[PDB]
Amino acid sequence: MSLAFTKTRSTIGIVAQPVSVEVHLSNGLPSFTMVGLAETAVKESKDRVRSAIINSQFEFPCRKITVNLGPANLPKTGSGFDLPIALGILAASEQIPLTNLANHEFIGELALSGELRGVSAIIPAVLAAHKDNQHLIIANANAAEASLTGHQKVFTANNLREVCDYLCQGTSLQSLPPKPDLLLNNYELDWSDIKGQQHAKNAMVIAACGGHSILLSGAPGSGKTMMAKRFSTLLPELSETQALECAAINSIRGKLPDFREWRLPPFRAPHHTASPVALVGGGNPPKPGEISLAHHGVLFLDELPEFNRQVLETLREPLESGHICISRAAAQIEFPAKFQLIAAMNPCPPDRISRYLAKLSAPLLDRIDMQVTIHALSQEELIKPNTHLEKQSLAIREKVTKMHEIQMARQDSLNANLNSKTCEMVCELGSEEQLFLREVMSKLKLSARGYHRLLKVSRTIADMNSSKKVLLNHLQQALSYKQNLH
Amino acid sequence: MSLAFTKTRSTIGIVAQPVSVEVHLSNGLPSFTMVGLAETAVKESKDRVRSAIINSQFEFPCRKITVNLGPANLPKTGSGFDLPIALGILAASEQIPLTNLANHEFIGELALSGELRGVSAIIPAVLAAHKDNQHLIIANANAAEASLTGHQKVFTANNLREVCDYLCQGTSLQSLPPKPDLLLNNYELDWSDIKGQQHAKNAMVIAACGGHSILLSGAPGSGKTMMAKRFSTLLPELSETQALECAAINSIRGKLPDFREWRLPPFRAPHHTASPVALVGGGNPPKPGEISLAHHGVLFLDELPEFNRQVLETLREPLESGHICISRAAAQIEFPAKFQLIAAMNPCPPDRISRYLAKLSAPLLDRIDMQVTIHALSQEELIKPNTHLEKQSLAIREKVTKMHEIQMARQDSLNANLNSKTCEMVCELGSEEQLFLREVMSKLKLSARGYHRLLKVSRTIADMNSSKKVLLNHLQQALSYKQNLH
Amino acid sequence: AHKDNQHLIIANANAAEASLTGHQKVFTANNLREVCDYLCQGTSLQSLPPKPYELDWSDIKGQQHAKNAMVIAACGGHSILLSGAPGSGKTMMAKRFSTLLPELSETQALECAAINSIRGKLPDFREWRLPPFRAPHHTASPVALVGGGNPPKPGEISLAHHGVLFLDELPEFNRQVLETLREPLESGHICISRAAAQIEFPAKFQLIAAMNPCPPDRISRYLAKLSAPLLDRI
Amino acid sequence: LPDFREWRLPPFRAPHHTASPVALVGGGNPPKPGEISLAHHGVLFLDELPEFNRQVLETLREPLESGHICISRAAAQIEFPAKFQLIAAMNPCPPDRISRYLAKLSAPLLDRI
Amino acid sequence: LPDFREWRLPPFRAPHHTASPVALVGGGNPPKPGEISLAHHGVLFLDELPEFNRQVLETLREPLESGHICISRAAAQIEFPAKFQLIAAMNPCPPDRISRYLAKLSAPLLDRI
DNA sequence: TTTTTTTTTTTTTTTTTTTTTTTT
DNA sequence: AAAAAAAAAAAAAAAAAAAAAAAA
Ligand SMILES: Nc1ncnc2c1ncn2[C@@H]1O[C@H](COP(=O)(O)OP(=O)(O)NP(=O)(O)O)[C@@H](O)[C@H]1O
Ligand SMILES: Nc1ncnc2c1ncn2[C@@H]1O[C@H](COP(=O)(O)OP(=O)(O)NP(=O)(O)O)[C@@H](O)[C@H]1O
């Protein structure tokens, strides 16, 4: 008859869910009705589309035009619906052969002259389009942003007539500019630029291999955030897909990285108090927060007890599943937050100790595997200049990569994410080691999860020593990283 | 078919984003349609533009008119969209040759007689136009404000007919007037009025010469606030590019400053009664706050134990990044906030003194580099008159001008902004210096931050002696200004 | 639809969720033409893809004294107060309890399915017919443990509908929170109200609580924090 | 609209010690002059001065020197004349109780009287 | 509305000893009747009075003589008639601490027994 | 060895800007 | 073809419940 289908994508949450644009024409008096929860920025696109179609020397149909943006449950805020609506209107009036619109997705604004203009936060659309294996058409102003993915099967155009020519006559035009240069870390910082703490350094290196969260205990003014800020150095380079996902997460916020930190794990340490709306998801049109940010990186947490209780209890979901499920009353949208957690805590500024320690949430203070006490540096070490022992981060990075490969070989998850049931099956335990653990529980009444936490850290230490299975010395070193002190 | 394009500037935050006005005429019913998120202040430009065009002996088209305002996602708030729309309507109707609108930007509010009216906050638009090398035409009422920049590519007009004549026959309009007939610095304020406080004045001298933040403590009624106020004169006069930015922020607020002091570094002390939105950011269309009003200047926080922590917890990020980002749920807005901190407090209002200090935010005091005490002024020295007329002023300002260049030659930041690693290799601590530093460290209870705080101010004092490295004499003086006692 | 005994016609895209109930009398369609053909002539639409362990009491040694008491509590539906010295948690006794209870019927399991479905991201694998066991964390939160806030979401107690609640170290908890757990025990549902209106989360379950009476003269203090009505219904 | 009665006698306004900061100084809404501005060119009396909250008393310093209070309603700011003359009455307390009582005063404001 | 009840017969209500101030009289949200507002024309059983909150027992003043507990949310005044009869029970309690025990009995309410 | 006040958070209210539905 | 009665949110202001902070 006189209806057509075109496919777009709208950035809701972090994932660009597919949006079906449906255009129908009927023999009524001329009109234009937009159906679907479209905001003003989209409802105003009627005149833009009419002018773009007319000024490109096409015939704008003088009939009842009905446009539906399915599905109808999701509000649509992106302004880049003009190009698909125009193509749908053209296809409905049989000015474009319909069979070529099946495998394409279109995103882009339209000025009244027919020239395309770019839209913001486009990278997630490209990611979704490739994931579904769909050709994507993009306004040429977005080629600079979209080329960072380096993804094929993405084309750009300048005018609506260019897109029409591509669809009908097949005169393919433009392609993503070539990928930018794959330069190197420019990482400065380095782990070498920290004076000798030794115990804290070794503990952090152990946890980086095992991906375990740590508590940075000790007196304030001792080097808590200073040591943490260098922890992201140890973590390995992210994969192509992981880097692309982090890039989309940052792109939705609006601050494009500088083409270099692409493969560097993020840090994004949140403020002291901040806001629970800001630090987890958001309201209005929902935007990612500090939790959603630093998806595959390391998240820092200074002055853990000070944080609001509701924030800490809502923080249970990520370390348990890696998703946030903030609801918008009508529905819910997911946020990926599978992050490494680093926390700092100061053992009180003796009556107040009970309430101060009790103020800290235990649901958070159960998955914090390791703890360490960061003693202040001796004046001799503070005043002594650093020999710098040449830069030392690539050796530790190589060690972490090898340990991660070893862990990936024996199961499909890291030791931090091991289930309680699989801990016994995976680990190779000797009889004397089991007897030693039984004797240890005589000395200290560790909880049920203490077993698995001690086993988890000792597994990384044992794999660190040379190979094979757990040993008495490994558990002996592990015992030092108990849950608390007092 | 004919349509016209016309460029203008709409200001959001501080920078004036480019906005392209598109006008298209169709053969439908005579209606006027405007799209592009028009705030109702500009949405009613239809009747104003219609009457302005009719009354200037032109011919208003009797056709359907569609007007599109730039990017479809940027709200338009200014009232100065009448002139671009009127010129677009004229150009689309072939009453103006289109080629002349190639590289011009128009800003101006029209009246029904055709006379142009001044629009508030014109300076950022002029700056943006000069950055892009574009002719800018404004109302005659804005000539006084636009003359600050002194750019030669800005023209002014009296009515729409003048603009049409300029675009059609090159009548050449009326250029903006020359720089105001004033050069005399004066400022009626200088360092001499502070009498008797030799030690604190000498310390504030080195505070200006290294960009260090300085904390002041002393008895009320002495020159604390006066020394803060006179501290502006010490800093070197701002460059033209910095003066334009400061004038842009000031004009955006609305307080047009006096031409006499448009190059002095701004000084603005916030008031204790202020919302966290008053100092930083703003509601509505975002407006610069108190902190950004002191860009490239000095911020004076008198009575530091006041200013409820809710206010001070927002000042953290600007002290490190030099800017603050405010989210409008649809875009991100940035405000320049690079400044120098000066704070004043009463040392004493028993163990209650600790509670008095407890209200202070430790991380804020972490960034402060210097502390001095305002001792009670001697009897006869104040009792003795001020017959001395040896006003220092220009001498110390000349000294700090060279001082900033000397620091800028070594690294890419002043002594206050040194990285911890860069504290060394710039201060070649000798054999005896380490000995003395070890002694003072052992006898005191300094932290890691305090040691590096001690090094930077000592570096600045070392430059004051035109010596390559510290000579154990600068360290002794540094201890006095250091020792952030409380 | 099941409660009223009514046929459902549902979009084919929703067959992923409606199949998880394993229901009959629920159909799926693609077009209005298919539904019109069904109503006019009955063209036999699709009817969802039908759907086809844990520990036991054997893992515990011959503790006949407590085992038979627990069985009686399960048979009679009464609560229980497994408590004493905190010996290695002792929660392994409670974890076995959920296995003893009878298998839930269609509506009973389906109601828990809906209650979980509200929280979004429907539980991952399987096992809807097994009654839940979800237990608190000895500190919880008044919003999280009971009812909720913001646009309402079921609390921990409601999630344990037709299941078991293992509230450990009862004395510590919160005095205000404990009394909020009153209406569900008596009626079987909560009526938490806030702002505009309220909704009724069904909260029928069974309670298993633990306590420590300390090693002197501190037993009275350790029991002084107890809520009388909550213990009176045990 | 006082007319013919006191249009040449200096105003005398004595706000009650609680009042409200949005009425004592400036205000919201399309702004209406507050208590402080109502005493322009006149006398302002503050009985039981320490009883006033420190937040309000710290605002008194700006008009006492600059001569006019500058309201700060985020987007907009307006000027109100405040050239008044200040008169204050305080009770020298009814141990550390003396220090606690005198802490409720504003040291700069009292030391500027 | 639960069951078929009896309606024609006097009601009986007994608060949950510790109870709550919002449950005994009035309530939040749109005005909801309190426990004391219940048992209208009936019998209210107040068991173990000292366990109750002192302020609420003081708030029982008007209901037992006036029969109306009109709530005040600063927006509306809903009446909620509460005519009833009081019945209370006391434990003599386990001697100078007897005064401490009796100090919580809310003597103004004890006068109406 | 025994009891209270205050500040913060949350909740509500109010105003205004936004929205959403008249009435030509 | 321009408007005005109604549903939602952002910010300022005031009151109730909790925490703790400090006082006997
Ligand atoms: N182990 C350390 N090694 C080298 N430098 C350190 C070390 N600890 C502190 N520093 C110095 O500490 C200064 C800033 O780091 P730091 O004091 O840790 O800030 P912070 O992490 O925000 N607060 P805190 O951790 O409590 O001290 C730098 O000059 C560092 O050089
Ligand atoms: N050498 C001097 N030392 C101190 N005060 C001086 C000196 N010379 C003049 N003064 C005068 O004394 C006034 C003191 O100002 P100041 O004490 O800073 O008032 P303020 O703004 O309330 N800050 P504060 O110091 O806390 O009282 C100055 O405004 C000068 O008018």
Amino acid identity, position E78: I
Largest CA distance in chain A: 90
Per the structure block, which two tokens stand in for B195?
A: 């009498």
**Closest-CA residue to A244 (of A364, A126, A385):** A126
Tell me A261's DSSP state: G
Q: What are the tokens at B388?
A: 């001395």
Name which of A418, A342, A332, A406 is nearest A374 in CA terms.
A342
H-helix or E-strand containing A23? Answer: strand A15-26
A232: enclosing H helix or E strand: helix A231-234
CB atoms within 10 A of CB A53: 23
List CB contacts (< 8 A) between C229 and chain E: 16
State the angle between helix axes of B394-410 and B198-208 in degrees (0 to 180), rounded to the nearest 10: 40
* CA-based radius of gyration for chain C: 22
Strands B135-139 and B154-157: parallel
Q: Is B336 helix (H, G, I), strand (E, B) or coil?
A: strand
**Å between CA of B116 and C1' of G20:** 64
Angle at C67 between CA C61 and CA C72, to 5 degrees: 165
Which of D62, D72, D96 is facing B350, going by the closest CB pair? Answer: D96
Whether C182 sits inside 8 A of E17 (CB atoms) is no
User: Which of helix, strand or coil describes residue B76?
Assistant: strand
| PDB experimental method | cryo-EM
The full 3-state SS of chain C, as one line of letters, equals CCCCCCCEEEEHHHHHHHHHHCCCCEEEECCHHHHHHHHHHCCCCECCCCCCCCCCCCCCCCCHHHHHHHHHHHHHCCCECCCCCCCCCCHHHHHHHHHHCCCCCHHHHHHHHHHHHHCCCCCCCCCCCCCCCCCCCCCCCHHHHCCCCCCCCCCHHHHCCCEEEEECCCCCCCHHHHHHCCHHHHCCEECCEECCEECCEECCEEEEECCCCCCCCCHHHHHHCCCHHHHHCC
Per-residue tokens: A32? 């234009």
- Read off the tokens for A2: 């006189």
Site of tokens 């497994």 = C82
The string of DSSP codes covering B348-359 is: ----HHHHHHHT
Name the residue among A44, A284, A285 with its Cβ closest to that of B35: A44
Integer Cα distance of A223 and A157 in angstroms: 53
Q: Which DSSP string corresponds to E22-71? A: HHHS--SSS----TTTSSTTEEEEEESGGGS-HHHHHHTTTHHHH-B---
Statement: the CB of C197 is under 7 Å from strand F: no
Give the Cα separation of C165 and A50 in Å (integer).
62
Q: Test C138 with A448 for CB contact under 8 angstroms.
A: no
> Which bases of strand G sit closer than 7 A to a protein CB?
2, 9-15, 17-18, 20-23
Please report, rounded to whole angstroms, the spatial distance between the CA atom of protein residue D57 and the C1' atom of nucleotide G23. 28
d(CA C56, CA C112): 23
Report which residue type is found at B143: A
> β-strands B298-301, B323-327: how paired?
unpaired
Cα angle, residue A255 at apex, residues A250 and A257 outer, rounded to 5°: 75
Do B194 and B441 form a contact (C-beta atoms < 8 A)? no
With an 8 Å Cβ cutoff, is C100 touching chain A?
Answer: no
**Alpha-carbon torsion (B46, B49, B52, B58), positive or negative:** negative
* Residues in contact with B386: Cβ distance below 8 Å, sequence separation at least 6, in sequence order: B192, B195
> With contact defined as beta carbons under 8 Å apart, do A372 and A50 qualify?
no
Q: CA-to-CA distance for B4 and B95, rounded, in angstroms?
A: 11
φ/ψ region of A287 (left if φ > 0, alpha if ψ in -120 to 50, else beta) reads: beta
> Which nucleotides on chain F have any atom < 7 A from a protein Cβ?
3, 8-16, 18-19
Return the structure tokens found at D82.
């405040």
Q: What residues are in contact with ligand 2 under a 6 Å CB criterion?
A: B 194-196, 220-226, 377; D 108
Residue B443: what are its φ and ψ, rounded to 5°? Answer: -75, -20
> b or e along E89-100 (b: 16 or more beta carbons within 10 Å of the residue's beta carbon)?
eeeeeeeeeeee
Pairwise CA distance, residues C148 & C155, whole Å = 6
Residue B115 carries which DSSP code? B
Distance CA C46, CA C195 (A): 44
Whether B and D touch (3+ CB pairs < 8 Å), yes or no: yes
Chain D hits for B39, Cβ within 8 Å: none
Of the CA atoms within 13 Å of residue B73, those in its CB half-sphere come to 20
Residue A323: its chain C contacts at CB < 8 A?
121
Q: Which residue numbers in chain D precede an interruption (C–N > 2.5 Å)?
A: 94
Token pair belonging to B282? 């703003």
Cα dihedral across residues A158, A164, A170, A171: positive or negative: negative
Rg, Å, chain A Cα set: 28
DSSP code of residue A159: B
SS3 state of residue D113: coil
Within 13 Å and on the Cβ side, how many CA atoms surround A331? 11
Q: What is the C-alpha to C-alpha distance for residues A374 and A363, in angstroms, rounded to an integer?
A: 24
According to DSSP, residue E76 is labeled: -
Contact A221/B437, CB-based, under 8 Å?
no
**Which residues on adjacent β-strands are paired with residue D76?**
D73
Distance CA E58, CA E61 (A): 6
CA E22 to CA E33: how far, in whole Å?
10
Check CB contact under 8 Å for C179 and E17: no
DSSP three-state, residue D81? strand
Chain A residue closest to B451 (CA)? A382
CB-based contact A38:A19 (threshold 8 Å)? no
Contacts of E54 (CB under 8 A, 6+ apart): E104, E106
A284 touches strand F (CB under 7 A): no
**Contact criterion met (CB below 8 Å) for B81 and A57:** no
Contact C15, C26 (CB under 8 A): no
Of the candidates D69, D84, D79, D66, the residue with the CA atom closest to the CA atom of residue D14: D84
What are the angstrom distances between the C-alpha of A287 and each of A128, A252, A330, A333? 18, 7, 17, 11
Alpha carbons C151 and C144: distance in angstroms, whole number: 13
Provide the shortest C-alpha distance from residue A302 to chain B (in Å). 12
Q: Locate all alpha helices (DSSP H) within B70-197, ordered by sequence.
A: 82-92, 123-131, 143-146, 160-169
Q: Which two tokens stand for residue A276?
A: 């629970």
- Residue A19 pairs in a beta bridge with A8
- Separation of B222 CA from ligand 2 center, angstroms? 5
Contact indicator for C97, C77 with CB cutoff of 8 Å: no
- Residue C156 CA to residue C154 CA, distance in Å, equals 7
Which of A177, A173, A98, A171 is closest to A137 using CA atoms?
A173
Would the CB atoms of B283 and D75 count as touching at under 8 Å? Answer: yes
Q: Which amino acid is at B372?
A: V
Residue C162's alpha-carbon distances to C102, C125, C132, in angstroms, are 10, 20, 7
H or E element that contains A251: helix A240-253
3-class SS of residue D61: helix
The answer for residues whose C-beta is within 8 angstroms of residue E72's C-beta and 6 or more apart is: none
Instruction: List the one residue out of B200, B206, B199 whose CA is nearest residue B404.
Output: B206
List all residues 6 or more positions away from A405 whose beta carbon is below 8 Å from its beta carbon: none
- Atom 23 (ligand 2) nearest CA: B225
Bond into A71 cis (ω within 30): yes
- Tell me the C-alpha distance between B106 and B122, whole Å: 11
Other residues' Cβ atoms within 10 Å of the Cβ of residue C29: 17
Q: Would you call A151 an interface residue with chain B, using a CB distance cutoff of 8 Å? A: no
In three-state secondary structure terms, B332 is strand
Q: What does the block give as tokens for E90?
A: 């006391």
Task: Give the span between the Cα atoms of A32 and A62, in whole angstroms.
Answer: 10
CB-based contacts of C127-132 (< 8 A; 24+ apart in sequence): C128/C20, C129/C103, C129/C104, C130/C54, C130/C98, C130/C103, C130/C104, C131/C98, C131/C101, C131/C104, C131/C162, C131/C163, C131/C164, C132/C98, C132/C159, C132/C160, C132/C161, C132/C162, C132/C163, C132/C164
Distance CA A452, CA A447 (A): 10
Cα three-residue angle E23-E26-E29, rounded to 5 degrees = 90
CA atoms of E33 and E15, how far apart (whole Å): 13
Distance, in Å, from the CA atom of D69 to the CA atom of D65, rounded to the nearest integer, reads 10
Q: How far apart are CA A159 and CA A171, in angstroms?
A: 14
C124: closest chain A residue by CA: A321
Q: How far is the CA of B449 from the centre of ligand 1 (A)?
A: 6
Q: Whose CA is nearest to atom 29 of ligand 1?
A: B420
C and E touching (3 or more beta-carbon pairs closer than 8 Å):
yes
Query: Which of E16, E28, E29 has the CB atom closest to C229's CB atom?
Result: E16
Across the strands, what pairs with D69?
Answer: D80
**D58: contact with B, CB 8 A cutoff:** yes
3-state SS assignment for residue B411: coil
- Cβ burial C31-63 (10 Å sphere, 16+ → b, else e): eeebeeeeeeeeeebeebeeeeeeeeeeeeeee
Total residues belonging to chain C: 234
User: Which phi and psi (to 5°) does residue B110 adopt?
Assistant: -95, 145
Return the half-sphere exposure (C-beta side, CA atoms, 13 A cut-off) of residue C57: 15
Q: How far apart are CA B212 and CA B202, in angstroms?
A: 14
**Cβ contacts of C69 within 8 Å, gap of 6 or more:** C80
Which ligand 1 atom sits closest to the C-alpha of A377? 1
Q: Is C77 exposed, middle or buried (0-12, 13-18, 19+ CB in 10 A)?
A: exposed
Judging contacts by C-beta atoms under 8 Å, the chain D residues touching residue B349 are 99, 103
Tell me how far apart the alpha carbons of residues D48 and D87 are, in angstroms, rounded to a whole number.
Answer: 11
**Given an 8 Å threshold on Cβ–Cβ distance, is B37 in contact with A44?**
yes
Resolution to 1 decimal place, in Å? 3.1
